[PDB]
Amino acid sequence: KIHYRKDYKPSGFIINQVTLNINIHDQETIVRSVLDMDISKHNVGEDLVFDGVGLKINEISINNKKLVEGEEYTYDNEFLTIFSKFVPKSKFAFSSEVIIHPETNYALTGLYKSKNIIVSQCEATGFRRITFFIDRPDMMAKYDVTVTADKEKYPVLLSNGDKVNEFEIPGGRHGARFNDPPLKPCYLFAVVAGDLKHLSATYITKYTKKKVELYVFSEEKYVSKLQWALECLKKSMAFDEDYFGLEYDLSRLNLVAVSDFNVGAMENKGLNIFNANSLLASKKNSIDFSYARILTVVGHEYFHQYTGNRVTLRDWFQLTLKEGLTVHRENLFSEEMTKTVTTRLSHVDLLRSVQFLEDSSPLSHPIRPESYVSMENFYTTTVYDKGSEVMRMYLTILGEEYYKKGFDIYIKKNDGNTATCEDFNYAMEQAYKMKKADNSANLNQYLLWFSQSGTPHVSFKYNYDAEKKQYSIHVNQYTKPDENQKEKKPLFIPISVGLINPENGKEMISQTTLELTKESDTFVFNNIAVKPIPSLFRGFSAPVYIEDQLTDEERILLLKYDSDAFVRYNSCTNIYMKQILMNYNEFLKAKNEKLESFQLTPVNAQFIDAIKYLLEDPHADAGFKSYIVSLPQDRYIINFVSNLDTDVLADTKEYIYKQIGDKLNDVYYKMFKSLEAKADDLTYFNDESHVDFDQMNMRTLRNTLLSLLSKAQYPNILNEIIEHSKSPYPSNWLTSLSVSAYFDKYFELYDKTYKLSKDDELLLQEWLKTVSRSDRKDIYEILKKLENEVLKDSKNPNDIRAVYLPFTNNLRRFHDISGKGYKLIAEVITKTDKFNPMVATQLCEPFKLWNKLDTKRQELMLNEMNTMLQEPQISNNLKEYLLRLTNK
Ligand SMILES: O=C(CNc1ccccc1)N[C@@H](C(=O)NO)c1ccc(Br)cc1
Ligand SMILES: [Zn+2]
């Protein structure tokens, strides 16, 4: 079945109360469920159909009358059908007893066992794998849940709500009962059982002065890695209080880390469950990246408590209303807490690489799709990250004060209810009306951000009249037709702009957000004393392709002197892109024409001079510096080249990196040495509450320079590499492994770092990733060694994703013209699809650009997707993904 957004219809049934008994045994888990139900005003006498996947039925009843299979109900392992003739006309009880098997549930959806912890994952459609339900988010009910288990193996028992009873059971078993009176959808139900250890704190809310208990749990081995998460939770609570004025409403919040998890974390009410790699860190055993990941993922699930949990989705097509909005709240949080410009830059760099690729691929979809078949395939960077950019533009358009007023309208009008994207637009419209002093002004055009797929292109032309002191910015917007809209309409595009005086680098006009609402417009500015350089889309103010039509000399001057971090970064990006496209076509012609000699256009010398200038600026940001020395991401570049030949791109990037290194390697080396003291400062190495994002950026800059100097084979850099391997920080010593790929000591540092990584589950996975991404000529043999010596038959999604996905970014080797790379990942996708369809679909990520490559590689990748499509046991998830991806 394909579900279409236009076909939403309230249920003809009501579920008022869920009473659950989940009894965990060694070989099986027994779920007894009583559903206090009713007939709704939309009933039309239909069969009572519950969702129920993979359940072994012991018995069902209606009003303590056991139902007979065949004459009274059919169950096909997916839908339980009780025919209307046996369905009461008033308040009735439906009860069932089913058997499920968490120990062998390797799809990690529903109830499953992660190492020695039983844990649930119910969003989107996992609750029906636990018991029968009308498994859809508008079906709101009260929950009363008892869990029993062997007490020695499972001493800690958690579910939603208040623990109201704890009782011993003969046979060394024990039980706990949890009552959660407030209504919730079933995807927010959770249960956890295990030998869990914890850190805890008490938070007192800002206004009600309520005492909230905060618990963070892990397995005993890793309980020393919980401190940052707890700190991040407190920060998230303060931020929503400080920025949005929202307080936590429950008496307890639990965070739980498990080793086996399909995604990052899950916002189950009062019982947030996390991938261990997004909750656990320690400075001895984690790379720097973990600290920003934990901060964002803890924040993200907390912010869901309002945007997702208190204000609910009517239906799954509204997904971006909770995910896009929560990512937006997440990003505002991280920007505030890290206080570095590279936080925002990192979100743009993700959007413009990953999400732009998806939105020009055959998978392109608006942030509110009109249909789906696999609800799990709905969870995408379009829905999340373009969703967040659409959510963020409300704030750009409105400003902080009226944005907060509109957000408050939304929460006040809809708290405790279901909502839709239109509800949010309406709340923002009310704030737009107050801001414009015009109650006729509206945001109806803005709704197209939700329904229109594809990335708008925004282009510029300029005019300066020197005698008139008059400056004109002519703007054009354009979206390519795709499979979702033949004719694209103009969106409401807010363009944050400044005007830079090229003589002194000063701002020429006040804060200004151009509201482009037509396919084209001309914005004129008077009293402009000299010809300015425009600073366009400051902060990346709309999710668009920016065609700035500036000269490289103009872009260099913005890069040196503009006030906005993103426009500086983007101006640099654009200079690189111009060079990349030029040298690419030059390498491509020489290859196509079989030239025996040929020329390459060198990198702009004034550009290199500007990079040196900024690198030598003591007062500049170390994180920003590391962005300017890095060419754009390969998946950003691919949006600008038809039939991209990856070897020619590899040769292009190589030439450009070499050109710049040939001028700046001595600068790179000087800085790498002068940065050591502050970057590797150990003063707070044993304080897990002390987290310094500037210092971590300094290490990123050192590790970026080290990589450049190593690839360049800078004299005696191997000494620096070996000394780096001795650093206490894993970002440093795992960096020493990857950059030693260019040297004969690689396999000596392979063994050294493995021995340092093998005793921590998460640190080993980072090691796997480092090996996987190593720029090695023998990388295929090294992956085979990982498979045989380390990965083996692990079904842990973290292990599989660590071995294979970084490798897929290896431009020369993953795209080896034999197809051996496409064949290797295809085999892994098909093998993984037999037990975890969602992760199988994640492993298809490299294929998303398949139709953007040279015709030979297009054919290689298509052949492999057609082979996976032909596997007789293919999951629905994977089949539907690959059918869409290949346009079938
Ligand atoms: O962990 C992440 C990371 N983001 C993400 C992951 C996959 C696809 C798109 C984005 N997302 C979780 C979230 O949003 N928690 O609040 C989540 C929860 C359930 C389901 Br089904 C899917 C994702
Ligand atoms: Zn989320």
| CATH number of the domain to which 791 belongs | 1.25.50.10
Residue 487 annotated as binding site: no
Distances (CA, A) of 3 to 185, 186, 375: 19, 19, 9
The number of residues making up the chain comes to: 888
Residue 793 domain boundaries: 573-886
Q: To 5 degrees, how large is the angle CA 729–CA 730–CA 734?
A: 130
Question: How far is 58 from 56, CA to CA, in rounded Å?
Answer: 7
Q: Which atom of ligand 1 is nearest to the CA of 323?
A: 14
Tokens representing 327 are 């990512």
Question: How far is 34 from 62, CA to CA, in rounded Å?
Answer: 10
Q: Widest CA span of the chain, in angstroms?
A: 95
Residue 300 annotated as binding site: yes
Tokens representing 249 are 């409403």
Tokens representing 821 are 């790379």
Residues with CB under 5 A from ligand 2 (ion): 323
Q: Are 228 and 690 in contact (CB under 8 A)?
A: no
Strand spans (E) along 466-511: 470-478, 493-500
Pure H helices in 675-760: 676-679, 693-711, 717-725, 730-739, 746-757
Place of tokens 């360049």: 712
DSSP state for residue 213 in the 8-state scheme: E
Q: Are 191 and 18 in contact (CB under 8 A)?
A: no
Question: How far is 754 from 771, CA to CA, in rounded Å?
Answer: 10
Q: Are 460 and 548 in contact (CB under 8 A)?
A: yes
Tokens representing 334 are 């991280």
Specify the 3-state DSSP secondary structure of 275: strand
Of the candidates 233, 194, 196, the one whose C-alpha atom is nearest the C-alpha of residue 218 is 196
Q: Are 77 and 111 in contact (CB under 8 A)?
A: no
Q: Which amino acid is at 87?
A: V
Q: Are 109 and 838 in contact (CB under 8 A)?
A: yes
Distances (CA, A) of 252 to 105, 564, 747, 818: 29, 41, 49, 56
Q: To 5 degrees, how large is the angle CA 222–CA 228–CA 229?
A: 80
Under 8 Å CB-to-CB from 381, ≥6 apart: which residues?
Answer: 350, 351, 354, 355, 358
Tokens representing 811 are 């431009």
Structural element, H or E, at residue 521: strand 520-525
Residue 323 annotated as binding site: yes
Residue 304 annotated as binding site: yes
Q: Are 277 and 798 in contact (CB under 8 A)?
A: yes
Place of tokens 């219809």: 9
CA 272 to ligand 2 centroid distance, Å: 11
Of the candidates 188, 186, 161, the one whose C-alpha atom is nearest the C-alpha of residue 176 is 161
Specify the 3-state DSSP secondary structure of 364: coil
Of the candidates 358, 353, 361, the one whose C-alpha atom is nearest the C-alpha of residue 382 is 358
Question: How far is 630 from 636, CA to CA, in rounded Å?
Answer: 13
- 296-299, Cβ contacts within 8 angstroms, sequence gap of 24 or more: 296/330, 296/333, 296/334, 297/264, 297/265, 298/229, 298/232, 298/233, 298/236, 298/255, 298/265, 298/272, 298/274, 299/232, 299/235, 299/236, 299/239, 299/329, 299/330, 299/333, 299/334
CA 384 to ligand 2 centroid distance, Å: 8
Please confirm, yes or no, whether 72 is among the known catalytic residues. no
Question: How far is 875 from 52, CA to CA, in rounded Å?
Answer: 18
Question: How far is 849 from 797, CA to CA, in rounded Å?
Answer: 23
Structural element, H or E, at residue 861: helix 855-869
Nearest listed ligand to the Cα of residue 187: 1
Place of tokens 């936080």: 343
**Mutational test site, ligand 1, from 263, 365, 385, max ligand atoms within 8 Å of CB:** 263
Residue 301, phi then psi, degrees to nearest 5: -65, -35
Question: How far is 347 from 324, CA to CA, in rounded Å?
Answer: 13
Q: Which residues are near ligand 1 (CB < 6 Å)?
A: 123-124, 263-267, 300-301, 304, 323, 376, 379-380, 384
Q: Which amino acid is at 341?
A: V
Please provide the DSSP assignment of 383-400 as one string: IIIIHHHHHHHHHHHHHH
Under 8 Å CB-to-CB from 755, ≥6 apart: which residues?
Answer: none
- Terminal Cα distance for the chain, rounded: 17
Q: Which atom of ligand 1 is nearest to the CA of 126?
A: 21
Place of tokens 């050591």: 676
Question: How far is 276 from 766, CA to CA, in rounded Å?
Answer: 13
Experimental method: X-ray
Place of tokens 């012609």: 589
Of the candidates 802, 803, 805, 784, the one whose C-alpha atom is nearest the C-alpha of residue 848 is 805
Specify the 3-state DSSP secondary structure of 685: coil
Q: Judge if the upstream peptide bond of residue 650 is cis by omega within 30 degrees of 0.
A: no
Strand spans (E) along 299-351: 312-313
DSSP state for residue 526 in the 8-state scheme: S
Specify the 3-state DSSP secondary structure of 560: helix
Question: How far is 311 from 327, CA to CA, in rounded Å?
Answer: 15
Of the candidates 699, 773, 721, the one whose C-alpha atom is nearest the C-alpha of residue 283 is 699
Q: Which atom of ligand 1 is nearest to the CA of 264?
A: 1
Of the candidates 264, 253, 267, the one whose C-alpha atom is nearest the C-alpha of residue 292 is 264
Helix-, strand-, coil-residue percentages of the chain, each rounded to 5 = 45, 20, 35
CA 425 to ligand 2 centroid distance, Å: 20
Backbone Cα Rg of the chain: 28
CA 308 to ligand 1 centroid distance, Å: 13
CA 387 to ligand 1 centroid distance, Å: 13
Under 8 Å CB-to-CB from 141, ≥6 apart: which residues?
Answer: 15, 16, 17, 18, 183, 184, 186
Tokens representing 401 are 């004060």
**Residues facing residue 167 across a β-bridge:** 175
Q: Which atom of ligand 1 is nearest to the CA of 278?
A: 1
Q: Are 142 and 163 in contact (CB under 8 A)?
A: no
Pure H helices in 495-645: 552-561, 565-592, 605-615, 622-628, 634-637
Of the candidates 556, 35, 329, 845, the one whose C-alpha atom is nearest the C-alpha of residue 548 is 556
Tokens representing 313 are 């989705």
Catalytic residue among 301, 586, 720, 880: 301
- 172-179, Cβ contacts within 8 angstroms, sequence gap of 24 or more: 173/148, 173/149, 174/148, 174/149, 175/146, 175/147, 175/148, 176/146, 176/147, 177/144, 177/145, 177/146, 178/143, 178/144, 178/145, 178/146, 178/147, 179/143, 179/144, 179/145
Distances (CA, A) of 639 to 137, 307, 367, 636: 37, 33, 20, 6
Q: What is the dihedral of CA 871, 876, 877, 880, to 10 degrees?
A: 80
Residue 542 annotated as binding site: no
Q: What is the dihedral of CA 38, 158, 272, 252, to 10 degrees?
A: 90
